[PDB]
Design a protein around this ligand. Structure first.
Ligand SMILES: NC(=O)c1ccc[n+]([C@@H]2O[C@H](COP(=O)([O-])OP(=O)(O)OC[C@H]3O[C@@H](n4cnc5c(N)ncnc54)[C@H](O)[C@@H]3O)[C@@H](O)[C@H]2O)c1
Ligand SMILES: NC(=O)c1ccc[n+]([C@@H]2O[C@H](COP(=O)([O-])OP(=O)(O)OC[C@H]3O[C@@H](n4cnc5c(N)ncnc54)[C@H](O)[C@@H]3O)[C@@H](O)[C@H]2O)c1
Ligand code: NA
Ligand code: NA
Ligand code: NA
Lengths: 257, 257, 247, 253
């Protein structure tokens, strides 16, 4: 029997909304492994759900932070230094595109919608990585979440496909710059899962149904399958792995037709 | 002998500022093949420089527009429609990032600098494709430029590597959306070439030395080699090719060690 | 206008057995552009069909050679040296897997059938490249044919998908080793042609490709218009392979 | 505080010849997690070497089979079924090319050398996978080892690069075909480690990789355990890199 024991480790998970959140799936696994966890949530409307999540984890520190505001980000990381002293793990589970941009055609996307989508969904990784750098200890790491439409055309996913391409490229450049300090940076490419952010997408049930009928495992993945991969990548079992996009999608992405 | 005759065809070429540029090379090959070319230029203080380019091409219509300004783009496309009636080809050779973003580390990129790089180098393709769509005739097409830094880490290419990843994903979604009108969209990934744009990339020069020393052909490519690929891709010879990123780099990107 | 003039160039085209061969389409465009063409054929019982193809091209030189036999390849390339003096272009359009390998599942492929599929469909590019090397002139090139299934799972393509993956890797190593002579090596990944309504429904262009579209890309890659391009796999499939789901 | 318990699970590990090798490293991590391991060995003259490996694993059953011989593979799998009743995991760490094929240029590879390399290094996965299928239980899996030379040109790797491309495509098709049984198939692409089988490439890698060092054999062992474990139940058809980030770089530093 092998064990993963993260007692003594300090983790920050950004982007929790409810118990179906993929960020919450990872936090739950890190907690279960023995890490001390903090969560950040977007806005005050979400605080009561976030309190429910800290309760479900059996205890978590909570912070509010909108990633479009640099001063809210400075406050988050000063708060982390005071509450933790330093940091081992950072999970980035944040994305957004305007509903107007996600129906219809990518070619028809308005300038300010496209810019907002890229700002929240890709630049936010660079912003949080810069601020985490002085805190992050040797052996520490950052993990983000992505999707296959960065590589191949999924109708209706539109500007989000382009933001995910920008995020994956940022993962590689950040792995190069943080590696000399012993810090790793990786991405998880998840298959469809029923979440707040996912079901708002107009394509969702159509692709959810397609995956189950075409993927090698003949089913969709679960949020727990994403949590286990995040746990592994952050843990010392993954100490030779940096700069990587790892797929947890029941093999859907390897299929043609 | 096989001959390709583009007489009667109409091309809009965007982003060209110097005769030593990959964008100029493609416009020059379109002229050689018999097409009429219109050039955009960014600002009225650059009119003299635009006039010299137009002369070096053996004649070209000129239109002012800054691609960050939507009303200006609407005006440019109004003039193109009045001059030509319809359009066959669009060459997108627009790339920019602030000096500060390119000196020092990717992790240290500032928010508005990152967003401007992305707006000018990637969103511009969507802005012009949308306005070109009702003008573009069956058989027509759009071609853009990229480089290996999108897929692999090249020290000091920084946010331009991320903008190019966004641009390549954009090419795939635009191919999907324009294809049913009979219009094709492709990217060219060029090896390092001695252009004026190359002077604004601190990483460029040691990559230049590496390619000559280590690529299969043991030399660098020329701007004429890039111009030939652009002409081929716009021509009827490439009528079955869309959504592609085609490398012209003396084979450098296939090498490992 | 742009002209492509290959007067004085010499081409060897391998693996053509009918006028629908993607190999024949590239041979046709090479001939239209002005090059002299040699076609190989597998055995003397097929001489009749090879003569017919030579006539449909408007004239071509014919050699017998089975790519599993090293001495037949040695004899082919001796004959090419005698008749042409040198070589500019080599078109590799050889593909085969036993019928038993292509019925049923990849996991059930028999050892003998798997090795024969690899030998004919992949090792053959190495064998012909080695023999062409001393003949190939500066600016010369080799081009081969492949398919999507090397990248993504297309059920029922079975061992041929694996053969193509081996073929594309050989392209890259061959580009490295022939590059100091000024010779280039590339592959063309073609969609389906009348040799399906589903491909037409999902392709961005809402149609299948034609064999002329493949012919034109082969000509371009071999021509001096492509002097900077080596080690590359280029897709001519109406955009099909960029799609992440079926329509 | 989270635990991988593989007690009562059964592994077959193929292609291991010494203790300082990547396949041994996976074998040891499966044992550490509670699995029982059966080891194959090529020929009876290597029994003494095999016994010494079984001892270094703290005990393993040993089974003779040359992977080019279908009858010998039939015998092995009959012996595994009688011994274990079934199987959970298969580790394919089999790699070989003739010395002559590895000296000089790829373009100079002789026919029989090329086909032998591909037979032993790639077709062996198909041969053992077909025979494992009826024994493999749901949740079960297959893992194999690869190298970045499949995708990118590494001089002097020669036909082994091409065998690795053949192997990785096989991994994808097998993932699709075994998926309905609930069995998973994946590959690990490892960077260079000081191994016996491996016989300044080591120095160049360390200078260039994001982590500025080479990987260890234990790092490879940990990834194999993960992929075979229930923790990876959503993951099939993948080639996962453990190379200190070396392969993300577009030039040497
Ligand atoms: N659910 C899926 O099918 C799926 C598949 C692949 C990838 N992903 C990715 O997983 C990640 C989490 O998504 P999820 O599916 O768990 O949905 P989710 O809604 O539970 O999580 C998305 C989070 O982003 C946060 N967010 C949005 N804008 C923000 C801003 N300006 N500032 C701070 N936070 C902001 C939201 O508050 C929310 O908590 C996303 O990156 C998503 O793209 C999801
Ligand atoms: N329709 C498709 O699925 C499609 C798509 C992409 C690429 N291709 C490729 O195109 C190439 C040629 O196929 P095609 O569609 O043009 O038709 P084709 O039938 O002419 O190709 C197969 C050829 O292989 C030759 N061949 C087989 N064994 C031989 C031997 N041992 N010695 C010498 N020659 C031998 C045959 O003579 C035959 O002409 C193939 O490599 C194929 O993979 C086909
Ligand atoms: Na800077
Ligand atoms: Na069969
Ligand atoms: Na040799």
């Amino acid at each position: 029997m092998l064990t993963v024991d993260l007692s003594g480790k300090k983790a920050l998970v950004m982007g929790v909304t409810n118990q179906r959140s993929l960020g919450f799936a990872i936090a739950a696994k890190l907690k279960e492994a023995g890490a001390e966890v903090a969560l950040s949530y977007q806005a005050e409307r979400l605080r009561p759900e976030a309190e429910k999540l800290a309760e479900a984890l059996g205890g978590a520190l909570l912070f509010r932070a909108d990633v479009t505001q640099d001063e809210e980000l400075d406050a988050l990381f000063a708060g982390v230094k005071e509450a933790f002293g330093g940091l081992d793990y950072l999970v980035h589970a944040i994305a957004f595109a305007p509903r107007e941009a996600m129906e219809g055609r990518y070619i028809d996307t308005r300038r300010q919608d496209w810019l907002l989508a890229l700002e929240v969904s890709a630049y936010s990784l660079v912003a949080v990585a810069r601020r985490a750098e002085p805190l992050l200890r040797e052996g520490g790491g950052i993990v983000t979440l992505t999707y296959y439409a960065s590589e191949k055309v999924v109708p209706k996913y539109n500007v989000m496909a382009i933001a995910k391409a920008a995020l994956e490229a940022s993962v590689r450049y950040l792995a190069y710059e943080l590696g000399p300090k012993g810090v790793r940076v990786n991405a998880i490419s998840a298959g469809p899962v029923r979440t707040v952010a996912a079901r708002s997408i107009p394509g969702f049930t159509k692709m959810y149904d397609r995956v189950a009928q075409t993927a090698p495992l003949r089913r969709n993945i679960t949020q727990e399958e994403v949590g286990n991969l995040g746990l592994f990548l952050l843990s010392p079992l993954a100490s030779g792995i940096t700069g990587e996009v790892v797929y947890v999608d029941a093999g859907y992405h390897i299929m043609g037709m």
